[PDB]
Amino acid sequence: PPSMSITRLFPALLECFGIVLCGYIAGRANVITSTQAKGLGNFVSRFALPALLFKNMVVLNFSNVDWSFLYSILIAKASVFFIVCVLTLLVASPDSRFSKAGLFPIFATQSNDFALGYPIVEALYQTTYPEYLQYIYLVAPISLMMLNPIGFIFCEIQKWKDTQNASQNKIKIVGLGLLRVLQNPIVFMVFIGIAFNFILDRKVPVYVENFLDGLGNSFSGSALFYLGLTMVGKIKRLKKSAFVVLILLITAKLLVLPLLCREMVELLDKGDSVVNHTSLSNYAFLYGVFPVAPGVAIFATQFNMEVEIITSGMVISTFVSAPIMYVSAWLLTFPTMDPKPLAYAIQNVSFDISIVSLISLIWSLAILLLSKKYKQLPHMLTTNLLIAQSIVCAGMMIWNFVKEKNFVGQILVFVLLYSSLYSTYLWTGLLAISLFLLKKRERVQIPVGIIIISGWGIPALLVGVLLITGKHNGDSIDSAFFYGKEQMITTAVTLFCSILIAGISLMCMNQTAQAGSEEEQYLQSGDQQLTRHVLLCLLLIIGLFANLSSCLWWLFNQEPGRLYVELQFFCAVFNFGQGFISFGIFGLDKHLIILPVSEEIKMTCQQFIHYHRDLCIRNIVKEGTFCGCDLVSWLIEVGLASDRGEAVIYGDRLVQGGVIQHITNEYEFRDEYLFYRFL
Amino acid sequence: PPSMSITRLFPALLECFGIVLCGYIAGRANVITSTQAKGLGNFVSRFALPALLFKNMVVLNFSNVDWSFLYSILIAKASVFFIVCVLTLLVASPDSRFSKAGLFPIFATQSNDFALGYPIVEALYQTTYPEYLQYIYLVAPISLMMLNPIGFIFCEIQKWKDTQNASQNKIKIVGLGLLRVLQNPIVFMVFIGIAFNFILDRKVPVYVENFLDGLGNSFSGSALFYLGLTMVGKIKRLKKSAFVVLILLITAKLLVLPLLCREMVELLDKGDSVVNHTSLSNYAFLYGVFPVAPGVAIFATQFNMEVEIITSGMVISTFVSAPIMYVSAWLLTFPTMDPKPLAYAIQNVSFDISIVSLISLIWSLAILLLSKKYKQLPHMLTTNLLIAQSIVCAGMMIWNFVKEKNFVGQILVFVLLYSSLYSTYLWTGLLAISLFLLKKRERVQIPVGIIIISGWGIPALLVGVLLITGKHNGDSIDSAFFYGKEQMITTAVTLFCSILIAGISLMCMNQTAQAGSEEEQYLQSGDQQLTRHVLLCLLLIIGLFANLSSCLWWLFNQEPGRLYVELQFFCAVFNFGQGFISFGIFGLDKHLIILPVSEEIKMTCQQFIHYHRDLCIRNIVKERGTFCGCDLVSWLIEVGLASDRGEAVIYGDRLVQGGVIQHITNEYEFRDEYLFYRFL
Ligand SMILES: *[C@@H]1O[C@H](CO)[C@@H](O)[C@H](O)[C@H]1NC(C)=O
Ligand SMILES: *[C@@H]1O[C@H](CO)[C@@H](O)[C@H](O)[C@H]1NC(C)=O
């Protein structure tokens, strides 16, 4: 029988994470400020989500539910909750372990079922298994009801113990926990919808069906866009211990929980069919990979506990769940697929990732170009790493079309593709050593020519050597085997060399960092960008090792097993999605990316002039000038602006109304520690 | 052949105007402030609407378009634009006629096609005529492109002439007009989508299809909810001339334009099939009834011209387009329907309006009850008018089920229904005379007992007389004919009496008004509520005359024509939707309806204490440490701590919940209602 419908997953992930990208880009551009974002959030959470829940709860046929799936996912979440909660209580400091042990387990267990899970489960299972869609709306509310009051109880215990009203007792603590759970619109409208599922005989009474549909159908896009908006400023830099804790919590949500879900289904589902049993446990895994709900960050801010870790982790979890979902769904379809269609399938994964990663790379190239940063170091070498990744993705798009044709011209496509791929590897090496040479004392100036020459020519020369030494096999569907064992050796050699160069050079960069224990802010900006390049080199090093280990496993075991095609698929993912990694690291400095009278502005200027002007000057101005960031901080502290977004837009109005200007008037209003004057 | 699918229209109008009601209620409760509302608006207009447009433009098969429909609707809009523009240029004052002649024609022509038009056209035509859905996405952008730059040119001329940079010329004026049109995301993304319709061979390339679907599918609900949010404070009281101008512009949009659309289709569509020609001109009318786009109000605020008239008119137009759409769609289906199914159809119209109007009346009753206003006058009599309307709607729900059964018990159902209906008529009379007796000098105190006694007993007595004088006919499907000519006479008598009592008493109330040429603000609130009751009596008087004229037309012409079943359908509409009218007039005083420390609040209090406290006191506080709540709201707005009265009340609510302030007796929470507060 045919599979779960896996070719529909990438379009659905583009829906999900591209609408989240739209929300992020809109908030980052201050098209929608955080105050404005709360309107979309209130629409979502108070109207669209409860209507979606109510409709799907009234329609739901409770006689047909596979309660074993609910029990298994629920017990998987309950056991992850037990693990994370008991661990946190044992490990965390007594000043905060109750807040942490409340919110960290909710983090580890509460999935983004509605906004992200449902479109993905729809796209995967709507045609093949339309009953699996019901279990989104079942598992998520029942999970809130069972598991969230335990975590809320621990947070209320933090409040009780910190406020020291020690005469109070279990009734108030447990009651406040349960009351938060009952008040939550998810739980609230699921009880209401279950009640009406029985009051009506599952028929939405026609009159309100269109109303409920209109609200619910809007939830999907609006919740994804609101998720993007809430992600805008959230990746704050954390303590090293908080980064380790984040990795543990994100691993709980995205790796431990789906594994436990799959195992629990294979324990509790004692139904007959092996194919439907496998599809159910595959769905259990997919369900486990969903990211953390933004609702957990709402809980954290409502308790004002662990807000930084939970918000940052919800954001990072959302980003990380996309590649893990794609990887995992394909991996689960593979052990139900034949080897030639499996080759074509990996080449469609490669083609998908390479097309949208190429568009990500074209954007990142426009960044490095129009910022003029491509003239500075390391950014010149980064531009070459991005051009290498772009030609990798282009070569993958060319290969997917050419692999069955132009039998000699496959050599040109292979030269393009694998010379550029070896170039991305070797540029990982050369960019890492550029970071070492930049962190070392600046008199050790980088030999730019030699390094760019090597970054392209050594890959070109290596592929020429491969053309000399290897034997053609265009009948191999994957580019990765076009010259067989010689290609695998040359690739392993390239990667082992690059991993050595990069590991050694990052260790030496680290040692020069240990030894360290407008133009000035632009140089400091270059150093901070170098630190982002350290992050890039670390992530790319992980990917390099993924590819090296795959090559080594094939070379060691030239009769490859199922784990080898897991590794070949993950190799494709890194090889072609490293462009997404770049795009996620260089999509940051909005002003460097983009930049290089109305009655509303009149009112802004009059509000300032007639009232706050002298007070502001008395607070900020020194020998008629002030930093833009300090006016932003003042507008926030004084409450004229709700956030840094409104603060920059109020500064933009005050500049466009001439209450202020930049000192040389060469720049518009910015948060970037530029300097401004009153007129 | 079967009709356009008219039973799907009421559920679609509930989608549309109930999600608009959700947005309105959410904004009125300050669940979403106006600043917060701009986020939903920017999502809609900058992402969801352009994605919807792009997808539907790429999919659109341009070989199959009935260009004659586009041309006809476009020429109908262009002629309405010409009429309204030339008229406004001739009639309006020279200080403003260029701004008015820009924006009033855009008002008269630009429909709310996407948010409200498309769900309705979907529900009506999706199964029967799925090609008619394309023409939403064609007519609306092409209408913007052709007609909006003319109006924008007139507004830019207002700017040029008021700023007096007289050395400038046509190039800048016309260029700014065209540039506003081109920048508009509708026009922008339709040009982009048409280009991609040809670049791709109409195939959305699978990868972005789900992305575009996710954004576009969300447009519907989010745009309706945003329309509700933008409607919250907008019905500002206008000059009498502005009210007349509003009626003319709303009539242009909702009555002149659909008639011209229908006529233009019947001129330009020279295709073969009569059934498909009739469905096309019916669609042209339906398309014309769509309300004014909120985009026109965005244009008005961006020019800062005619903002009050246009915003208020967009709001009122949205409200008025709902009953006119329902009425019109059913009326257009009637001349393609058989008489017994036409009777069942009007009973289903009556059942629809009566159910949701009954829920509106249950809400309005909860208003009058929990505000305790039902003890005060005129509100006691208004509670009786609402109970009469509730028992009317309940009787209609009972009649729709009973009319084929319980052949003797139909008498009990008829007694309930038509005694309560006669009671709503007679209560229009008695409420109007209560307004006269309240506007007259207060020593002329109302005889409450006699008036409530009459308001229920005279209808009960009249229906008893009908039971005596009439002949039963349960085989008549409509309640309105259950006792035939005697029922029509008794109804006409009831209405003629009520219209006389109400017209005379409203004229006498008007004469006492001409002669006029915390407890104090609560009494003034009672008088303002009486003025809202004047509005109710006026609207109900229109409905009374609708029913009286229908009864008279049948009694005069006892072989009724097609126009008589138009009038019987409109009678049903008023008889059972007067509850919506009440619900739209009594859903106003939120605090009277509903009412009778966090780090965020700490931060609010600290922002005030550490900075604005002394400045505020120096501005507002007097020896009445005290200040009105409305004045702190006005100050928070003028000082920019709050963006609007919504944020201002929520900041006052935080400052109260944080104890920076309290009410003078602490008996009340923070309000805009000229209550009085103190610092601590
Ligand atoms: C598997 O699921 C399909 C689709 O829901 C259903 O038709 C079929 O009966 C199921 N088979 C088994 C063995 O459960
Ligand atoms: C009406 O339109 C439909 C759909 O295009 C077409 O199939 C049918 O032939 C038309 N009928 C007439 C009578 O024109």
Curated annotation (Swiss-Prot), chain B:
Record region (PIN-like transporter): 1-337
Predominant location: membrane
Annotated region described as GPCR, given as residue ranges: 347-592
GO MF term list: cholesterol binding
Membrane topology per record: Multi-pass membrane protein
Cytoplasmic topological segments: 27-46, 93-100, 156-180, 232-240, 304-313, 370-381, 427-447
A Gene Ontology cellular-component term: extracellular exosome
Effect listed in the UniProt record for changing residue 10 to I: Strongly reduced cholesterol-binding
Subcellular localization: Lysosome membrane
Effect of residue 24 to A: Strongly reduced cholesterol-binding. Abolishes cholesterol-dependent mTORC1 activity
Glycosylation sites: 276, 348
Ranges that cross the membrane: 6-26, 47-67, 72-92, 101-121, 135-155, 181-201, 211-231, 241-261, 283-303, 314-334, 349-369, 382-402, 406-426, 448-468, 488-508, 536-556, 567-587
Domain of life: Eukaryota
Positions with a binding annotation for cholesterol: 10, 24, 233-235, 532
Disulfide bonds: none
Any GO BP: cellular response to cholesterol
Lumenal side: 68-71, 122-134, 202-210, 262-282, 335-348, 403-405, 469-487, 557-566
Alphabetic keyword roster: Glycoprotein, Lipid-binding, Lysosome, Membrane, Transmembrane, Transmembrane helix
Domain DEP: 611-680
Record keyword Transmembrane present: yes
Self-association state and partner proteins as the record states: Homodimer; via the transporter region and DEP domain. Interacts with the GATOR1 complex and prevents interaction between GATOR1 and KICSTOR; this interaction is disrupted upon cholesterol starvation.
PANTHER family the record matches: DEP DOMAIN PROTEIN, INTEGRAL MEMBRANE PROTEIN GPR155
Protein function: Cholesterol-binding protein that acts as a regulator of mTORC1 signaling pathway. Acts as a sensor of cholesterol to signal cholesterol sufficiency to mTORC1: in presence of cholesterol, binds cholesterol, leading to disruption of the interaction between the GATOR1 and KICSTOR complexes and promotion of mTORC1 signaling. Upon cholesterol starvation, GPR155/LYCHOS is unable to perturb the association between GATOR1 and KICSTOR, leading to mTORC1 signaling inhibition. Binds indole-3-acetic acid and may play a role in tryptophan metabolism.
Domain remark from Swiss-Prot or TrEMBL: Cholesterol binds at the interface between the PIN-like transporter region and the GPCR domain; these two regions likely coordinate to sense cholesterol and regulate mTORC1 activation.
Name this protein carries in UniProt: Lysosomal cholesterol signaling protein
Species whose genome carries this gene: Homo sapiens
The gene coding this protein: GPR155
